[PDB]
Design an enzyme around this catalytic site. Structure first.
Site, PDB file in Angstrom:
ATOM      1  N   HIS A  41       5.543  -8.479   5.598  1.00 57.17           N
ATOM      2  CA  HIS A  41       5.212  -7.074   5.359  1.00 57.17           C
ATOM      3  C   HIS A  41       4.025  -6.597   6.211  1.00 57.17           C
ATOM      4  O   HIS A  41       3.585  -5.456   6.056  1.00 57.17           O
ATOM      5  CB  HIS A  41       4.962  -6.795   3.866  1.00 57.17           C
ATOM      6  CG  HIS A  41       3.759  -7.484   3.293  1.00 57.17           C
ATOM      7  ND1 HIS A  41       3.856  -8.481   2.345  1.00 57.17           N
ATOM      8  CD2 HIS A  41       2.435  -7.296   3.504  1.00 57.17           C
ATOM      9  CE1 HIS A  41       2.644  -8.885   2.004  1.00 57.17           C
ATOM     10  NE2 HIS A  41       1.764  -8.184   2.698  1.00 57.17           N
ATOM     11  N   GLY A 143      -5.965  -6.909   1.272  1.00 56.18           N
ATOM     12  CA  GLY A 143      -6.277  -7.640   2.486  1.00 56.18           C
ATOM     13  C   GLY A 143      -6.174  -9.149   2.358  1.00 56.18           C
ATOM     14  O   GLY A 143      -6.259  -9.856   3.379  1.00 56.18           O
ATOM     15  N   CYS A 145      -3.507 -10.815   1.663  1.00 52.58           N
ATOM     16  CA  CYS A 145      -2.177 -11.291   2.029  1.00 52.58           C
ATOM     17  C   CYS A 145      -2.266 -12.301   3.172  1.00 52.58           C
ATOM     18  O   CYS A 145      -3.075 -12.152   4.093  1.00 52.58           O
ATOM     19  CB  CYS A 145      -1.280 -10.109   2.412  1.00 52.58           C
ATOM     20  SG  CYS A 145      -1.204  -8.862   1.094  1.00 52.58           S
TER      21      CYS A 145
HETATM   22  O1  LIG Z   1      -3.329  -6.051   0.132  1.00 47.75           O
HETATM   23  C1  LIG Z   1      -2.419  -5.932  -0.671  1.00 47.75           C
HETATM   24  N1  LIG Z   1      -1.481  -4.973  -0.681  1.00 47.75           N
HETATM   25  C2  LIG Z   1      -0.599  -5.068  -1.845  1.00 47.75           C
HETATM   26  C3  LIG Z   1      -0.643  -3.826  -2.763  1.00 47.75           C
HETATM   27  C4  LIG Z   1       0.706  -3.832  -3.484  1.00 47.75           C
HETATM   28  C5  LIG Z   1       1.597  -4.595  -2.552  1.00 47.75           C
HETATM   29  C6  LIG Z   1       2.982  -4.668  -2.564  1.00 47.75           C
HETATM   30  C7  LIG Z   1       3.599  -5.460  -1.607  1.00 47.75           C
HETATM   31 CL1  LIG Z   1       5.338  -5.571  -1.596  1.00 47.75          CL
HETATM   32  C8  LIG Z   1       2.885  -6.171  -0.666  1.00 47.75           C
HETATM   33  C9  LIG Z   1       1.496  -6.092  -0.666  1.00 47.75           C
HETATM   34  C10 LIG Z   1       0.869  -5.283  -1.593  1.00 47.75           C
HETATM   35  C11 LIG Z   1      -1.132  -6.373  -2.504  1.00 47.75           C
HETATM   36  O2  LIG Z   1      -0.653  -6.928  -3.477  1.00 47.75           O
HETATM   37  N2  LIG Z   1      -2.163  -6.825  -1.723  1.00 47.75           N
HETATM   38  C12 LIG Z   1      -2.779  -8.145  -1.876  1.00 47.75           C
HETATM   39  C13 LIG Z   1      -3.469  -8.201  -3.201  1.00 47.75           C
HETATM   40  C14 LIG Z   1      -4.242  -7.222  -3.841  1.00 47.75           C
HETATM   41  C15 LIG Z   1      -4.629  -7.736  -5.025  1.00 47.75           C
HETATM   42  O3  LIG Z   1      -4.118  -8.976  -5.128  1.00 47.75           O
HETATM   43  N3  LIG Z   1      -3.373  -9.264  -3.950  1.00 47.75           N
END
Ligand SMILES: O=C1N[C@]2(CCc3cc(Cl)ccc32)C(=O)N1Cc1ccon1
Ligand SMILES: O=C1N[C@]2(CCc3cc(Cl)ccc32)C(=O)N1Cc1ccon1
Lengths: 305, 305
Positions: A41, A143, A145
């Protein structure tokens, strides 16, 4: 003596973390040999994440759209491909800090260390377990990820987890390093429900053995039980069923303490039925389930890497 | 979101750990620049540890009696001196992996990461606090002496702790890197009693703020209190007294959540008086006191190193 939620030393993994940017999205990647692994993603915008068609989004991307920065030095991307839910970026330079490593897909109940990272830089390390519903209870902010989970055996890093997303309930979901999600989750911003979070019974028993080894014995009771009788209590308390494979894996802890596995199950059963009466075990006021039997023997015998 | 007992990434410290042998005793040392720091009881035998005269034992030692092994390569010892309870071994080679570093003597209630080591090799990393009675509740086995505690700020490692010994109660005692023990302990195998282990009140409040930030709000109550009224409750429960310096340090968490510090103290007070009724906070069934206010802001904002 003493017993701590202990993570593996993270230096071997710190040397593999990089920053990956595509368009306006920045996340972490894992640089091993001449490949960088990151969540696919990274190619998405926020408007994209409601129903992304990753194959279509990837058509509009070329090698030079992927900016990979290792420390403060820029890596040249010479090829890219999507494998399940991860992107593999082929770079022209092998990581000189690449450790011996393997990619492993773990089972629920197994534990691992997480190196939480932002903009390709390490923030902290902590110990996690893959929950029976295939989530992890992590500590992640936007961030994070592409942060990875791993285990270490002497000199070999086994990577088992890459972080992809937070569910609306605040628990975390991700993939193995082949890009396959743990559990039924998909990388899109849709409401996705996790499943019952049950307690990892074999881990609780291992931690009870660790308590005994360290001198915390008040919960040892006069009773024994049977595997079927224990499990009938286990299901009432949303504990995973105990099998004879689990009994087998606890054998060395049973041998060290002289407490039969089924006797420890009887002690656990009375703790589930009576609670802990405001007492503590190894400094916890609840039953801890994120130590595996191997974790307990490792920590109680001082295995190094 | 989520909240975890998180340690600093340990790679910068892993590169400084070495094995030090003298006679038949082997422990860990810290190799920074061209000096190796280790506990001075490396010169002792077990018969020595009841009442060691370290000055006299050191007369019988020369540079070549100190065997220092970094990885699987041998360091040449060109001088040695005793500073308080640590030995400083001057070697002929500066550690090429030496990070920027400082030696700091911490205050009770402050937290740090421990890299537990055996035979100069890292075994695991975990987060600790210096208890108000100047012990730490660690995880250490025989051979762990010389393992170090540290904090990291961007690129600078602040070393604050070197492990020396386990008390008969199973808690741990050690020195700063100038060799001065934390608390009243001495490096001899005599029964030494620790003092009352009180709870670090400002840390509990920080962790309550962390709970609120992460959505765990059931304990928020309708009351407020005063610093003198709270502390009168604090002493009954063996909590450290809260001062206006502590209130000041909680200010940023108060500002983020909109909950006045004294309102949070009133919530804590009701938790001390009523208990938690089988509820949990951030997955704990007791009040956690090994997160500092700075830890909470760090983890909740994603500071990297
Ligand atoms: O940085 C991001 N963007 C998010 C917001 C929702 C989302 C949905 C998808 Cl499909 C992919 C990534 C994201 C996310 O979950 N995180 C990492 C995170 C934040 C809190 O805990 N982990
Ligand atoms: O390896 C040793 N030797 C010990 C045994 C008692 C002792 C007394 C003194 Cl004065 C100095 C060192 C030692 C010790 O405490 N450790 C480290 C350890 C073991 C468990 O937790 N930490």
């Amino acid at each position: 003596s003493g017993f701590r939620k202990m993570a593996f030393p993270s230096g071997k993994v710190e040397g593999c973390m990089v920053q990956v940017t595509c368009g306006t999205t920045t996340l972490n990647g894992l640089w091993l040999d001449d490949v960088v692994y990151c969540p696919r993603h990274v190619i998405c915008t926020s408007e994209d994440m409601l129903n992304p068609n990753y194959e279509d989004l990837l058509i509009r991307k070329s090698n030079h759209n992927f900016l990979v920065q290792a420390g403060n030095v820029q890596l040249r991307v010479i090829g890219h491909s999507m494998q399940n839910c991860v992107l593999k970026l082929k770079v022209d330079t092998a990581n000189p800090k690449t450790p011996k490593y393997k990619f492993v897909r773990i089972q629920p109940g197994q534990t691992f260390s997480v190196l939480a990272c932002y903009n390709g830089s390490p923030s902290g390390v902590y110990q996690c377990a893959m929950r029976p519903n295939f989530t992890i209870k992590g500590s992640f902010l936007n961030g994070s990820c592409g942060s990875v989970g791993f285990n270490i055996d002497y000199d070999c890093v086994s990577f088992c987890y890459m972080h992809h997303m937070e569910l609306p309930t605040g628990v975390h979901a991700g993939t193995d390093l082949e890009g396959n999600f743990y559990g039924p989750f998909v990388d899109r911003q849709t409401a996705q429900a996790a499943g019952t979070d049950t307690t990892i019974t074999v881990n609780v028993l291992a931690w009870l053995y660790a308590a005994v080894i360290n001198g915390d014995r008040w919960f040892l009771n006069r009773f024994t039980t049977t595997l079927n009788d224990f499990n009938l209590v286990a299901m009432k308390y949303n504990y995973e069923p105990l099998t004879q494979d689990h009994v087998d894996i606890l054998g060395p802890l049973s041998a060290q303490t002289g407490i039969a596995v089924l006797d420890m199950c009887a002690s656990l059963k009375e703790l589930l039925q009576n609670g802990m009466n405001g007492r503590t075990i190894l400094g916890s006021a609840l039953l801890e389930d994120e130590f595996t039997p191997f974790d307990v023997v490792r920590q109680c015998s001082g295995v190094t890497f």
